[PDB]
Every structure is written in structure tokens, then in C-alpha cells.
Amino acid sequence: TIPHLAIDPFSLDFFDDPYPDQQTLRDAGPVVYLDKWNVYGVARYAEVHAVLNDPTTFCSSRGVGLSDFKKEKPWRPPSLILEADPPAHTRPRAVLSKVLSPATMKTIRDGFAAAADAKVDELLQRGCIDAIADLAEAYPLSVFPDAMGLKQEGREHLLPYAGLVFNAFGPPNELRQTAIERSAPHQAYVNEQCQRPNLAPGGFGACIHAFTDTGEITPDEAPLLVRSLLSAGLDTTVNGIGAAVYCLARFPGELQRLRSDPTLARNAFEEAVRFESPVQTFFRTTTREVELGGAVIGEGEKVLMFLGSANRDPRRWSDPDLYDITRKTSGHVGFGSGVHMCVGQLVARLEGEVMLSALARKVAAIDIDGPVKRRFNNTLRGLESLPVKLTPA
Ligand code: HEM
Ligand SMILES: COc1ccc(C(=O)O)cc1OC
Ligand SMILES: [Cl-]
């Protein structure tokens, strides 16, 4: 028997305060049934990790949102990487892994670090800043669009385009329906910027299209792989950076430990991703009957994974509700796990590291000062506004 719960993990009240409900989702049993959306879920670390690491049984090609692509019309042409299974997934995964490789990070890191330091020096001249608009948003906007090779015009569609894609994985509630009603101009902008003549030489977009020249991908595939990096590669990092600043603001003792040893910057950022889990949820679909958490689940069934919950599961983590910058974070599922584990995770950790390193070296205190406003999204957790006072070192 699978326990039934009435929790709506896509409701505003849940977004505004998820922790008691995530606890209940964990503690009711290892597999739950959600009355509201008629779907199975798993919220503990063990099950979430086991599902992520069995892609044959728990496939992605039937979509990683609620909608079942075998049954329902995808709201947009499916991603070649996120919404595919091996073997079809492998060649596009290989292309983006090479585009976003450690050797590539080396070539862009000095520029990203200089931007992060200049950003923090500029914020400290104002003192009173919005850690979202002026920092979690402004910093990735200053490095990632340039790193892709994108033109200047139309960049203001990037954040709302990614908000839409993330809302569209969710159930058919008002967040999802309003995003889709308003999607056309964001998609028209992104479609144009995926085309080879619009991507500057040297940048990720141009590097992707160079795979057509060796026959590694077709001219039709290349724009869809650019589209992947424009769907996933900005808002995620905005929310991960926003999480880490919010964590440093709420846990003054951790900011002081970071200031004592700035080489903690990389792990301080990793722990922010665990702690807040910017991407909260993803689904899979069963490919056969499977025993999961002691329950037998039939073939063809959607399963919701609570990544944010797995990252706070006390069966896996000591004091999961504390932000601890020296925590051993290895194994958290905030970037996923297994064959689809975040292919952009080195870009995200580069931005995260260099930014917290700048904060480590330059800032003595971060005090929230003003109303904190949350942004609601079906898949993304993060704030809309986070007014803070920064005190220089
Ligand atoms: C803190 C920031 C980030 C977080 C929390 C995050 C989270 C995730 C998660 C949970 C998945 C696994 C999806 C699944 O299992 O279905 C994923 C995959 C993916 N991520 Fe990220 N990501 C971040 C940054 C980025 C960046 C900066 C890029 C690109 C530059 C990117 C590109 C992708 C792509 C294309 C996939 C699909 C990979 C595959 O299916 O093999 N991500 N990410
Ligand atoms: C991690 O989130 C994503 C990953 C890949 C893609 C993709 O479009 O391939 C989209 C995502 O959501 C906006
Ligand atoms: Cl699109």
C-alpha cells in the first residue's frame, strides 16, 4: 500500500515554506502517492539517488516534467539531451561535455574571476544593493551571454525564457499556463540566437556548431544543442549564486569562516546548491514494472523526484538544515546524478567559486535590510529580491 498525501508541491504555500511538507513527503513512506496530481513521488535520498542512477528503468524520453510525451504533445520540440535516453542521448551529451570541459573552464576562468571582483568592488561603492538584481542576476548576465557568443540585443529575454522552460516541467497550474501563453517572443528570440551566423567566434555557441563540420552532429541538431545551453545555463546559476548569498546573509558565522579561508569558496557554493537546491524536482517514467522503496510500480508511470528533499534527508546528512561550508557535499543531488548529471556543472561552479572568492576577500558583513521577496516557479526555487547591506573588509 502506498500512502496518499494531499500535499501540492507545486502550490504557492508549499513554495513559500516547503520544509514541513518535504519532511512529511519523506516520513510518510519511501514512495508516496500525490492526490492533487495523481502521480507517485519519492522524497528520500536513497530512492531519489537510486532512480537517477537507473535510466533504463526510469527513462527521460517520456519527458522529465509531469507530462508524458508518449501520451501528450510536448509544449516545445523535446531537448536532444535532457529528454532523451541512452543510446540517443550519448552523442549530444558528448558534444556539450566537450564544449563545457575542464580545459574550456581554464581558458575562461581569469575573465570570469576579474568580472566577479569588479562586480563586488562596484557593489561596495553603493553599499545597499539588491543581492538578486545586482549580484545573483547581474553577475551571470555579465559573463555567460558573452561566453556563449550571444549578441547584445534581446538578452533581456534570457531569464524569462528559462523561467518558462522551468515552469513548463510542472503540472498544468496557473504558473505553467500563464508562462506558455506568454512564450512566443522569448522563443522567437532564442530560436534566432541558436543559428550559426548569430553566435560569435570562440564562444560556446560557435564551438557547438563546429561539431557539424566533422559530422559529429547535423546542421539541424546544432541549433537544438545551443537551445539547451540557453534554456539551462543562466537561471540555474542565478539561483545557485542567490542561494549562496542568502545562506551567507543568514549564517554570519559561516561567512566569517569563509573570510578566514577563502579556498572554501568552491565548497561554500556546493553546499549552497545542496542547501537550497535551486532545481527542486524532476520526473522520470517507468519503462517496466519495478519495485521501488518496497512498492511495486507498473510500467508507464511518472515518478516525481524531490531533489531538494533528498538533499535535506536526515537519513543521508548530519544536521541537514544547517549551512556548513566544510560539509562533505559529495553525493548531493542538486546537479542530478548519473548519465544526465548536470553537463554545465563546471560553469556553474566556476561562477559560484569566483563570486564567493570575491566576497571572501572583499566583504566583511552581509546584512539583510528590507523585505525579502520569493519568486515562485514550478521547478526553480529562489528569490526575486534580497536587499542587503554589504560592509567592506
Ligand atoms: C547551480 C546551477 C545549476 C544547477 C542547480 C543545475 C541542475 C541540473 C540538474 C538537476 C540536472 C539533471 C537533469 C535530469 O537528471 O533530468 C541538470 C542537467 C543539465 N544541466 Fe544543469 N544545473 C546548473 C547549471 C547549469 C549550467 C551553467 C548549464 C550550461 C551552461 C547547465 C546545463 C545542463 C544541461 C544541458 C543538462 C542536461 C544534461 C543531460 O541530460 O545529460 N546547467 N542540471
Ligand atoms: C537542468 O535544466 C535543464 C537542463 C537541460 C535543458 C535542455 O533544454 O536541454 C533544460 C533545462 O531546464 C530549463
Ligand atoms: Cl523553445
Query: Closest Cα partner for 267 from 279, 258, 276, 259?
Result: 258
Query: What residues contact 167, with CB distance under 8 A and at least 6 apart?
Result: 175, 176, 179, 180, 377, 378, 379
Greatest C-alpha distance within the chain: 60
CATH topology of domain 1-393: Cytochrome p450 (1.10.630)
Instruction: Please classify residue 252 by burial: count the beta carbons closer than 10 Å to its beta carbon, then call 0-12 exposed, 13-18 middle and 19+ buried.
Output: exposed
Resolution of the coordinates, Å: 2.0
Q: What whole-number distance in Å separates Cα of residue 298 and Cα of residue 184?
A: 37
**Residue that the C-alpha cell 581569469 belongs to:** 110
Q: What whole-number distance in Å separates Cα of residue 244 and Cα of residue 299?
A: 39
- The CA distances from residue 251 to 85, 186, 246, in Å, are 40, 37, 9
Q: What whole-number distance in Å separates Cα of residue 26 and Cα of residue 43?
A: 5
**Residue that the C-alpha cell 570570469 belongs to:** 112
> Which residues, in sequence order, are bridge partners of residue 385?
373
Q: Do 262 and 359 form a contact (C-beta atoms < 8 A)? A: no
Query: Closest Cα partner for 59 from 79, 90, 85?
Result: 85
Write out the residues surrounding ion ligand 3, Cβ under 5 A: 76, 187
Q: Do 75 and 66 form a contact (C-beta atoms < 8 A)? A: no
Q: What whole-number distance in Å separates Cα of residue 373 and Cα of residue 389?
A: 16
Pairing of strands 58-59, 382-385: unpaired
| Residue 56 CA, ligand 3 centroid: distance in Å | 27
> Which residues, in sequence order, are bridge partners of residue 290?
297
Q: What whole-number distance in Å separates Cα of residue 164 and Cα of residue 33?
A: 27
Which method was it determined by?
A: X-ray
Query: Residue 274: what residue type?
Result: R
| Residue 340 CA, ligand 3 centroid: distance in Å | 20
Q: Which atom of ligand 1 is nearest to the CA of 60?
A: 16
Query: What residues contact 336, with CB distance under 8 A and at least 6 apart?
Result: 52, 279, 282, 307, 342
Pocket of ligand 2 (CB under 6 A): 79, 81-82, 162, 165-166, 228, 231-232, 279
Q: Do 329 and 352 form a contact (C-beta atoms < 8 A)? A: no
Q: Which atom of ligand 2 is nearest to the CA of 81?
A: 9
For 171, the grid coordinates are: 503540472
Within 10 angstroms of residue 207's Cβ, the number of other Cβ atoms is 19
Query: Residue 356: what residue type?
Result: L
Instruction: Please classify residue 53 by burial: count the beta carbons closer than 10 Å to its beta carbon, then call 0-12 exposed, 13-18 middle and 19+ buried.
Output: middle
Q: What whole-number distance in Å separates Cα of residue 215 and Cα of residue 301?
A: 37
One-letter-per-residue 3-state SS of the chain: CCCEECCCCCCHHHHHCCHHHHHHHHHHCCCEEECCCCEEEECCHHHHHHHHCCCCCEECCCCCCCCCCCCCCCCCCCCCCCCCCCCCCHHHHHHHHHHCCHHHHHHHHHHHHHHHHHHHHHHHHHCEEECHHHHHHHHHHHHHHHHHCCCCCCHHHHHHHHHHHHHHCCCCCHHHHHHHHCCHHHHHHHHHHCCHHHCCCCCHHHHHHHCCCCCCCCCCHHHHHHHHHHHHCCHHHHHHHHHHHHHHHHCHHHHHHHHHCHHHHHHHHHHHHHHHCCECEEEEEECCCEEECCEEECCCCEEEEEHHHHCCCCCCCCCCCCCCCCCCCCCCCCCCCCCCCCCCHHHHHHHHHHHHHHHHHHEEEEEECCCCEEECCCCECEEEECEEEEEEC
Instruction: Please classify residue 201 by burial: count the beta carbons closer than 10 Å to its beta carbon, then call 0-12 exposed, 13-18 middle and 19+ buried.
Output: exposed
Query: Closest Cα partner for 92 from 279, 227, 233, 235?
Result: 227
Q: Which atom of ligand 2 is nearest to the CA of 169?
A: 12
Helix axes 158-168, 235-250, angle to 10 degrees: 90
Instruction: Please classify residue 333 by burial: count the beta carbons closer than 10 Å to its beta carbon, then call 0-12 exposed, 13-18 middle and 19+ buried.
Output: buried
Q: Do 28 and 37 form a contact (C-beta atoms < 8 A)? A: no
The residue extents of the domains of the chain are 1-393
49 lines ligand 1 (CB under 6 A): no
